[PDB]
Amino acid sequence: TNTLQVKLLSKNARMPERNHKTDAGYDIFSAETVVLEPQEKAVIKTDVAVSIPEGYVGLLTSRSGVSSKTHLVIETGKIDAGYHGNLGINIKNDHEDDKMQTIFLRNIDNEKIFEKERHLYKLGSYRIEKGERIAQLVIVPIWTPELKQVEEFESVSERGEKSFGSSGV
Amino acid sequence: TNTLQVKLLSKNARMPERNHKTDAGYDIFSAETVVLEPQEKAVIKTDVAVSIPEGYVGLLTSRSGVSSKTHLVIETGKIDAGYHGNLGINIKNDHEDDKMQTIFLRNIDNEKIFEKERHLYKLGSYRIEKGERIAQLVIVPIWTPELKQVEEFESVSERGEKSFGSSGV
Amino acid sequence: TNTLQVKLLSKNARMPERNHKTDAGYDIFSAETVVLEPQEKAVIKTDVAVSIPEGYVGLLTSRSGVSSKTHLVIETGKIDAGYHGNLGINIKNDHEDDKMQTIFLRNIDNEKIFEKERHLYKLGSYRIEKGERIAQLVIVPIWTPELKQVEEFESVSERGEKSFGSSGV
Ligand SMILES: O=c1ccn([C@H]2C[C@H](O)[C@@H](COP(=O)(O)NP(=O)(O)OP(=O)(O)O)O2)c(=O)[nH]1
Ligand SMILES: O=c1ccn([C@H]2C[C@H](O)[C@@H](COP(=O)(O)NP(=O)(O)OP(=O)(O)O)O2)c(=O)[nH]1
Ligand SMILES: O=c1ccn([C@H]2C[C@H](O)[C@@H](COP(=O)(O)NP(=O)(O)OP(=O)(O)O)O2)c(=O)[nH]1
Ligand SMILES: [Mg+2]
Ligand SMILES: [Mg+2]
Ligand SMILES: [Mg+2]
Ligand SMILES: [Mg+2]
């Protein structure tokens, strides 16, 4: 216990490491370089596999910096215990496709990228480099009971059926 | 303990079941058939109610397959302990509305749907059938302390106020 | 133990309080008034700081009411233990920018706002008032093991490398 097995699947892969000593998540490095146009979706390889023990789940989620500064949206992945495959980052460039054109790509600091040779890109296009920290992994314990069908619940609650903004705002 | 009460609210409802033995979440079946246009939002009924015990929360979240293959975005729901109402799936078709037209709907495998009779749809429109697994439920334990206002914290940390991409990328 | 330190950073800040007795999250009050145009992104100040103890993470996430009724999308924040800075709400108005114009803003109940003096707004624009509950905070325990590189995992699983809709739909 108190150890997690990690396998690197290629030379493009880098070991997860958490920022601060008491930090929740282990920052994830991209194992490939990808340009994403507006509204373009993709699964980004990390070339990294883990072995989360039973009774736990992994949360492959976004970082506050990247997600707040750019239009790169990462759908939080639920990494099952026993999944030994390549961790994929479920991502979308949710920048609107307004049909505009530029010569500058954006990095994940939302800074314009200057290249020697000039190409035409769709506005709002991003580039992710191999080795950049675009995500992180947080492991939490789960409760996994056997399900039992009932006609009525054992105990009545104060909440009942209240939902979706019932307490208001 | 080690059991969760589940109530089926109609004949359209189906019991949650998890895929693998050590899997984190219980796949959720839609209890209705719905077509969603681009940018259309909805709450999808499961006709299923649960009784998560105190000290736990339910995460009504997305599946990797559906979310990565389609523009169907599910906002992760936080199912409170004691909520005995109908579990609703908070969903949006975030496909852009470009005013294009087609005769093919898409399923949640993003495959074109062929019908005998031909209708005109907005491009990027999806159809969810009753009985399809569009989501899953993961239960985790929560910490629920009493709050105490302070002027200063008891212990100084290494992180302090650092946030939003402070460690960089 | 069983207590969480909370610091209010200004007179605009309000103490987090959970809705029901067994509720998972503590509703978060905005400490500022902001208008968000379509596709506009921002980090919204709460002027509130907490001291989550080691072994835990905070989930600064959305409410079902606001998120389902409006186009205001909150990216779930992972609040590290030891972070004593101002809690920021990572938000985007994902309403499409169709270049339409109106005289009515929308509140976070998606109701049209009537003002004495009439201004022109982009359609799909929202207004968040100081003091409104736009988010909530749920704290869960985390597992934080030391990482160990391996060439192969200790135990073979039933899942293996199966992922992204492998069980189908
Ligand atoms: O996606 C969801 C989210 C929540 N729910 C249920 C469970 C939850 O207990 C209830 C409300 O959860 P929230 O407290 O997170 N939303 P809100 O604060 O707007 O509702 P309320 O005012 O009643 O607390 O609605 C769903 O059915 N689906
Ligand atoms: O929505 C959020 C997310 C995070 N935070 C805070 C808490 C968290 O401890 C801090 C940074 O969290 P992350 O590590 O997930 N983001 P990032 O990796 O970009 O920042 P840093 O480089 O400092 O770790 O910012 C917020 O205030 N709101
Ligand atoms: O973002 C993700 C999400 C999941 N995964 C992995 C881990 C997880 O164990 C696997 C599938 O997770 P889900 O069960 O949540 N998705 P789905 O139900 O569509 O796949 P499957 O049918 O195999 O269970 O894919 C990723 O690599 N990245
Ligand atoms: Mg970080
Ligand atoms: Mg969008
Ligand atoms: Mg699954
Ligand atoms: Mg609530």
Distance from the first to the final alpha carbon of chain A: 44
Locate tokens 């070339």: which residue? A47
Q: Name every chain C residue with its beta carbon within 8 A of the beta carbon of A143.
A: none
Q: Whole-angstrom Cα distance, residue B169 to residue A106?
A: 14
- In angstroms, what CA-CA distances link C166 with B130, C10, C159? 20, 50, 10
Q: Whole-angstrom Cα distance, residue C63 to residue C52?
A: 21
B7: exposed, middle or buried (C-beta count within 10 Å: 0-12, 13-18, 19+)? middle
For residue A83, the 8-state DSSP code is B
Task: Kindly tell me the sign of the dihedral angle through the C-alpha atoms of C29, C30, C32, C35.
Answer: negative
- In angstroms, what CA-CA distances link B32 with A125, B71, C25, C65? 37, 19, 29, 21
Which segments of chain C does DSSP mark as H helices, in order? 64-69
Q: Whole-angstrom Cα distance, residue B40 to residue B48?
A: 23
Sequence-distant (6+) residues with CB within 8 A of C14 are: C8, C29, C31, C48, C131
Looking at the CA of B168, name the nearest ligand: 2
Distance from CA of C71 to the nearest CA of A (A): 14
Tokens at residue A47, please? 């070339």
Of B63, B80, B154, the CB nearest to C20: B80
From the CA of A59, how far away is ligand 3's center (Å)?
A: 11
Sequence-distant (6+) residues with CB within 8 A of B11 are: none
8 Å CB contact between A70 and A92? no
Q: Whole-angstrom Cα distance, residue C146 to residue B34?
A: 46
8 Å CB contact between B27 and B18? yes
B20: exposed, middle or buried (C-beta count within 10 Å: 0-12, 13-18, 19+)? middle
Question: To which H or E segment does residue A89 belong?
Answer: strand A88-93
CA B40 from centroid of its chain's CA atoms: 16
Give the residue from C144, C146, C159 with the most A CB atoms within 10 Å of its CB, the best one to mutate: C144
B110 SS3 class: coil
Q: Does the beta carbon of B87 lie inside 6 Å of ligand 1?
A: yes
Q: How is the beta sheet containing A41-45 ordered, strand by strand?
A: A41-45, A88-93, A72-74
CATH of the domain at C34: 2.70.40.10
Locate tokens 């490398």: which residue? C161
- In angstroms, what CA-CA distances link A132 with A25, A29, A137? 16, 5, 15
Q: C125, C31, C26, C33: which is closest to C72 by C-alpha? A: C125
8 Å CB contact between B36 and B42? yes
C44 SS3 class: strand
Tokens at residue B114, please? 């062929």
Which segments of chain A does DSSP mark as H helices, in order? 64-69
Tokens at residue A97, please? 């496709």
Task: Kindly tell me the sign of the dihedral angle through the C-alpha atoms of A98, A101, A105, A109.
Answer: negative
Distance from CA of C1 to the nearest CA of A (A): 17
Calculate the CA dihedral of residues C15, C19, C23, C24 and round it to 10 degrees: -40
Q: Whole-angstrom Cα distance, residue C53 to residue C83?
A: 10
Stated in angstroms to one decimal place, the resolution of this structure is 2.4
Locate tokens 């907005």: which residue? B122
What's the total number of domains in chain A? 1
C58: exposed, middle or buried (C-beta count within 10 Å: 0-12, 13-18, 19+)? buried
Other residues' Cβ atoms within 10 Å of the Cβ of residue B15: 11
Distance from CA of C117 to the nearest CA of B (A): 31
Q: Whole-angstrom Cα distance, residue C57 to residue C139?
A: 6
8 Å CB contact between A154 and B5? yes
C127 SS3 class: strand
Ligand 2: nearest atom to the Cα of C85: 27
Ligand 2: nearest atom to the Cα of A65: 19
In terms of CA atoms, which chain C residue is nearest residue A85? C161
State the residue range of the domain holding C80. 1-169
- The half-sphere exposure of A149 on its side-chain side, counting CA atoms within 13 A, is 9
Q: Whole-angstrom Cα distance, residue C76 to residue C136?
A: 10
Give the residue from C68, C79, C87 with the most B CB atoms within 10 Å of its CB, the best one to mutate: C68
For residue B82, which phi and psi values (nearest 5 degrees)?
105, -15
Question: If you write DSSP's letter for every residue of A123-159 in order, what string do you get?
Answer: TT-EEE-TT-EEEEEEEEE---PEEEE-SS-SS--SS
Q: B71, A94, B123: which is closest to C94 by C-alpha? A: A94
Q: What angle do CA C23, C27, C32 make, to 5 degrees?
A: 180
Q: Whole-angstrom Cα distance, residue A125 to residue A4?
A: 36
For residue B11, the 8-state DSSP code is T
Q: Whole-angstrom Cα distance, residue B20 to residue B23?
A: 5
- The half-sphere exposure of A22 on its side-chain side, counting CA atoms within 13 A, is 20
Q: B108, B39, B76: which is closest to A77 by C-alpha? A: B76
From the CA of C95, how far away is ligand 5's center (Å)?
A: 7
8 Å CB contact between A159 and A74? no
8 Å CB contact between C26 and B143? no
Longest Cα–Cα distance of chain B, Å, equals: 70
A114-135 burial code (b ≥16 CB/10 A, e <16): eeeeeeebbbbbbebeeebbbb
Is C85 annotated as belonging to a binding site? Answer: no
Q: Does the beta carbon of C63 lie inside 6 Å of ligand 1?
A: yes
Residues, chain A: 169
